[PDB]
Design a protein around this ligand. Structure first.
Ligand code: CL
Length: 122
């Protein structure tokens, strides 16, 4: 049914993964808020899976900025995976791509995981 389900992948220890359920509007924003303050063992790498996300509004983008700030305060590396060309365009116009760094943004979970693995190894 879904060859790219997280359950089908090899997820290194120290990598946490959070999958968004759709458009990143106020619902998703309310759920992502503060997620790093309730994980007890802070992840080295956090992957936000965005394959289901074609669109983000201002509230979504505000939550995503504050989440990236929370990751930097915890020395967690944020990666985005499954970023479509339309989402990337939104995130670039908002300024988020240049703030996070292009090398942290992937179009597929396999690539993000490959990088996460390298980061945990090193
Ligand atoms: Cl993804």
């Amino acid at each position: 049914d879904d060859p790219d389900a997280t359950s089908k992948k090899v997820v290194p220890l120290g990598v946490e993964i959070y999958e968004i359920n759709g458009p990143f509007f106020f619902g998703v924003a309310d759920r992502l808020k503060g997620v790093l303050d309730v994980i007890e063992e802070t992840p080295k790498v956090f992957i936000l899976r965005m394959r289901r996300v074609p669109v983000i509004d201002a509230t979504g983008m505000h939550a995503l900025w504050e989440f990236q700030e929370s990751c930097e305060k915890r020395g967690t590396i944020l990666l985005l995976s499954g970023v479509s060309d339309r989402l990337y365009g939104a995130l670039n116009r908002f300024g988020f791509i240049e703030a996070l760094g292009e090398e942290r943004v992937f179009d597929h979970i396999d690539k993000a995981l490959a990088y996460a693995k390298l980061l945990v190894e090193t």
